[PDB]
Design a protein around this ligand. Structure first.
Ligand SMILES: Nc1ncnc2c1ncn2[C@@H]1O[C@H](COP(=O)(O)OP(=O)(O)O)[C@@H](O)[C@H]1O
Ligand SMILES: CC(C)n1c(=O)cc(N[C@@H](C)c2ccccc2)[nH]c1=O
Ligand code: BEF
Ligand SMILES: [Mg+2]
Lengths: 781, 157
């Protein structure tokens, strides 16, 4: 083990042993013969070249099947020294099969993290590996990329290291398709800082940050086809630190919750976890309090899709949720208010309406309305009277409006989504309140966990908002990696050839957010009351079919749901259904009922609606979503980003199984190869001359003598020139020193070492001093 | 590696032999120092070797060998001759740079408590007693150290 001892039982899952390493460096390999050839099914296969005649190479696959291919097709394998490499930017041959096979080989050894130059790649193991313990947290603490294997704990430390050195806010941007591992890794970044904090409401700040996610997930996460624990809202967690790097505070900002789910489920999905956790009957008292049965099929709002998930123990999860609230210091009144309002939502959908004999709705019984009103601190009669006959102002008096059954049914649904969404926002504000300390803040490390890219058989407004964010984040990566990076080289006068990596999604983003775009057309249509779903569809088509390359006709299939257009997103073409986007965007509420909510006897409910106002105000869902997303993006622009790219291996949640075309599609649309190329071809690290002189004068003070003013650039030139480094690895800019990949790391190894030698030679002289004092005493007597 | 040429004058050897008697803790004055005493003798004679460099001349001794093993002047002299043959002990500018790593603000002053902790935890750990005795009245009104002054101080004597 040696260097790998600090990790313990985790070491074989992070870095292979020297004994395993040398066994690989003796394996059979012929530079000329051993290659990679494409495959129509499995993307690329390893092969040994038998012969070639007429620019058509013949070879045998790893499955033992002979085949002949052209020129471009044949790609060089990397020698056995590169087997399961920790940073792929260090491979001799960098192409698609080299990246894919290095990931496949590592994944096969349960090594899920791999560096890709300045960023990191992770493949979902669909298995819990002994690599996230406190012993590992301590092992990664302070380590440089060289002395530590790839891991989310490593990304976390490196982000903390740049925070203290540069005295600058950092961000961890975890990307991926729904099911990839974003939430998993977000919670590990939080674990890292919380465990480190525990070393040198009810629980401590560290226990509270850890418990924040089990609480929000009960309400904001649900089982969808691609993920049993899908995030139905996006979040940004800022972990605040003091000047000395001590954990100070933390805060959570959440984004657009999938309100639709509360009252609606597609064939293969569930409502929010909380409903089923409560129904588990682990805490029977909750069912008695909520006046509910233990059967989800008795609750129409939640029983449309599935009600149980194999991977999910709702009884164990309810305990997790209830305890999270205890740790975050929620009162019994606060906890029960959330439970009673969840039950009230469950009863709301069981409220049935019928037509008055000879076009107005009236209640079809009151039992569920009585139960709902009891829990919500309302008078059931006022609520039913308020749903059927809402009051509308006639200047200096009040006139009641009529409502048919469909209108009342729509209203009770809308009010249920409103109570739920508002109760979620209450819980985030409440958590933030516990997480806010009196302690001083200098900087933060913000973690971004968005709702991942999804494609269902039915895609609506919900999916456009979700996928739009993924597009916007992918373009944040593109802009940072390929645009700013190269503009920096030119800006600093570094000799550079601009490279078009073909990573630009502005076209698509513009089709969505820019004026006359999908969202703009929707927001404009919300203004007209005569407007319908078809008038909106008509406007979209007029303005974009055959005009915006990314907007296409829907690619409808027999039996599969109707779609109105198809949008070519970065991660794939999605067929959208525009039915009900106008109601979705305006989100109108029966204000007479919202008034009874304000006058509620349940302290919690009145608080949720006290502030209430909203229109088509004149602020829409899409308008507010675009606004919050741009606020996020510009705030992220003022942070040092660190990207974690989560790859989903297969569509069957199978551990250790890679689907070659699926892994490949992800590596392509993420631009993993392009991102490795810019690290290799460019200068990934750079430092201002003043900061360089400061930090590395220690390496050789004689190059920068203390007497005179030495021009900061001539100081950097003479200092680096004096060192035992490759003098081709650095270039001089107008304000900064540019370093080719790996030079900064070596400069840091040299610095760490030299610093320890100085300490010891200082201590050696201290020892000489203390001893010569005692010798003077000997000379006295 | 006890096969070293002695390039010390007959004068030098007598002056060292004179300091050597002072460390002679033997009852019968058999002119022998322990292996543990060796480091303190090298230091008394002008050298400032590292714990490691001393153990190198002592042929990597055992714990109760440092306390029990005896050495005459003739076995000590080559050790001093070898130790003196290292002059890469660190320049003033190197030491200042080493301590300047802890000057978080670059004002030329490091917090007294910080320098103490550094000397007691990093490199070859110094004892709380060694750092107390060494940091004796070195701190200003604010309880911090001018590391350029501390370096000049330890370098002289
Ligand atoms: N590093 C990991 N270790 C173990 N299981 C993981 C890991 N990453 C993901 N998973 C599995 O994948 C599931 C979905 O992960 P998740 O992080 O919620 O995806 P998303 O990117 O959509 O938020 C988890 O419930 C877990 O079973
Ligand atoms: C990402 C890159 C542009 N970069 C660097 O290449 C160096 C930075 N700062 C220097 C001072 C540093 C050196 C050693 C450890 C941390 C920070 N900041 C940086 O942001
Ligand atoms: F399904 Be993951 F939460 F994006
Ligand atoms: Mg998630």
């Amino acid at each position: 083990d040696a260097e790998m001892a600090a990790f313990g039982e985790a070491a074989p899952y992070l870095r292979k042993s020297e004994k395993e390493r040398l066994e690989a460096q003796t394996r059979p390999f012929d530079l000329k013969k051993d290659v990679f050839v494409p495959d129509d099914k499995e993307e690329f296969v390893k092969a040994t070249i038998l012969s070639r005649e007429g620019g058509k190479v013949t070879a045998e696959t790893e499955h033992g099947k002979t085949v002949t291919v052209k020129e471009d097709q044949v790609l060089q394998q990397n020698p056995p020294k590169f087997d399961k490499i920790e940073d792929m930017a260090m491979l001799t041959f960098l192409h698609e099969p080299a990246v894919l096979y290095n990931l496949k080989e590592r994944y096969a050894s349960w090594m899920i993290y791999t560096y890709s130059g300045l960023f990191c790649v992770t493949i979902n193991p669909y298995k819990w590996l002994p690599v996230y313990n406190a012993e590992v947290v301590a092992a990664y603490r302070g380590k440089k990329r060289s002395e530590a294997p790839p891991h989310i704990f490593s990304i976390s430390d490196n982000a903390y290291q740049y925070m203290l050195t540069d005295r600058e806010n950092q961000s961890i941007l975890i990307t991926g398709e729904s099911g990839a591992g974003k939430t998993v890794n977000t919670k590990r970044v939080i674990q890292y800082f919380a465990v480190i904090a525990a070393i040198g409401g009810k629980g401590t700040l560290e226990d509270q940050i850890i418990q924040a996610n089990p609480a929000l997930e009960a309400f904001g996460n649900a089982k969808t086809v691609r993920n049993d624990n899908s995030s139905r809202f996006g979040k940004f967690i800022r972990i605040h630190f003091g000047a000395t790097g001590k954990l100070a505070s933390a805060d959570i900002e959440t984004y657009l919750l999938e309100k639709s789910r509360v009252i609606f489920q597609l064939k293969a999905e569930r409502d929010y976890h909380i409903f089923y956790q409560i129904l588990s009957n682990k805490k029977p008292e909750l069912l008695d309090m909520l006046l509910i049965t233990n059967n989800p099929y008795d609750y129409a709002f939640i029983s449309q899709g599935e009600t149980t998930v194999a991977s999910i123990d709702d009884a164990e999860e309810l305990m997790a949720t209830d305890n999270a609230f205890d740790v975050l210091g929620f009162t019994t009144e606060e906890k029960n208010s959330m439970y009673k309002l969840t039950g009230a939502i469950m009863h709301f959908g069981n409220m049935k309406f019928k037509l008055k004999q000879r076009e107005q709705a009236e209640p079809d019984g009151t039992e569920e309305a009585d139960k709902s009103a009891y829990l919500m601190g309302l008078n059931s009669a006022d609520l039913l009277k308020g749903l059927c006959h809402p009051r509308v102002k006639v200047g200096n008096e009040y006139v009641t409006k009529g409502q048919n059954v469909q209108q009342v049914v729509y209203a009770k649904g809308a009010l249920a989504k409103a109570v739920y969404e508002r109760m979620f926002n209450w819980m985030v504000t409440r958590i933030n309140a516990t997480l806010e300390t009196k302690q001083p803040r200098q900087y933060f490390i913000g973690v971004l966990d968005i709702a991942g890219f999804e494609i269902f058989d039915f895609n609506s407004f919900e999916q456009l908002c979700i996928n739009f964010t993924n597009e916007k984040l992918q373009q944040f990566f593109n802009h940072h990696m390929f645009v700013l990076e190269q503009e920096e080289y030119k800006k600093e006068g570094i000799e550079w050839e601009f490279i078009d990596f073909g990573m630009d999604l502005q076209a698509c983003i513009d089709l969505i957010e820019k004026p006359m775009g999908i969202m703009s057309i929707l927001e404009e249509e919300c203004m007209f009351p005569k407007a319908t779903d078809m008038t909106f569809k008509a406007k979209l088509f007029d303005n974009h079919l055959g005009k915006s390359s990314n907007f296409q006709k829907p690619r409808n299939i027999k039996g599969k749901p109707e779609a109105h257009f198809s949008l070519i997103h970065y991660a794939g073409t999605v067929d959208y259904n525009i039915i009900g986007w106008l109601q979705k965007n305006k989100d109108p509420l029966n204000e007479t009922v919202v008034d009874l909510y304000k006058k509620s006897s349940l302290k919690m409910l009145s608080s949720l609606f006290a502030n209430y106002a909203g229109f088509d105000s004149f602020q829409t869902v899409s308008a507010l979503h675009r606004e919050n997303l741009n606020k996020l993006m510009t705030n992220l622009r003022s942070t040092h980003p660190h990207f974690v790219r989560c790859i989903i291996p297969n569509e069957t949640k199978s551990p250790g199984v890679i689907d070659n075309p699926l892994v490949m599609h992800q590596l392509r649309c993420n631009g993993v190869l392009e991102g490795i190329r810019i690290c290799r071809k460019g200068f990934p690290n750079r430092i201002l001359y003043g900061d360089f002189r400061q930090r590395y004068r220690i390496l050789n003070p004689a190059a920068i003598p203390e007497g005179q003013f030495i021009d900061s650039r001539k100081g950097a030139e003479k200092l680096l020139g004096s060192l035992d480094i490759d003098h081709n690895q650095y270039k001089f800019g107008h304000t900064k020193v540019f370093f080719k990949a790996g030079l900064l790391g070596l400069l840091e190894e040299m610095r760490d070492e030299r610093l320890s030698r100085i300490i010891t030679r200082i201590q050696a002289q201290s020892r000489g001093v203390l001893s010569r004092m005692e010798f003077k005493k000997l000379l006295e007597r | 590696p006890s096969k070293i040429k002695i390039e010390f004058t007959p004068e030098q050897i007598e002056e060292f032999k004179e300091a050597f008697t002072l460390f002679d803790r033997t009852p019968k004055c058999e002119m022998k120092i322990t292996y543990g005493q060796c480091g303190d003798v090298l230091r008394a004679l002008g050298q400032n070797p590292t714990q490691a460099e001393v153990l190198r001349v002592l042929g990597k001794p055992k714990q109760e060998e440092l306390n029990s093993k005896m050495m005459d002047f003739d076995t000590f002299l080559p050790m001093l001759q070898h130790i003196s043959k290292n002059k890469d002990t660190g320049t003033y500018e190197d030491f200042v740079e080493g301590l300047r790593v802890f000057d978080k603000e670059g004002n030329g002053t490091v917090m007294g408590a910080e320098l103490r902790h550094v000397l007691a935890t990093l490199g070859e750990k110094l004892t709380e007693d060694e750092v107390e005795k060494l940091m004796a009245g070195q701190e200003d009104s604010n309880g911090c150290i001018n590391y350029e002054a501390f370096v000049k101080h330890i370098m002289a004597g």
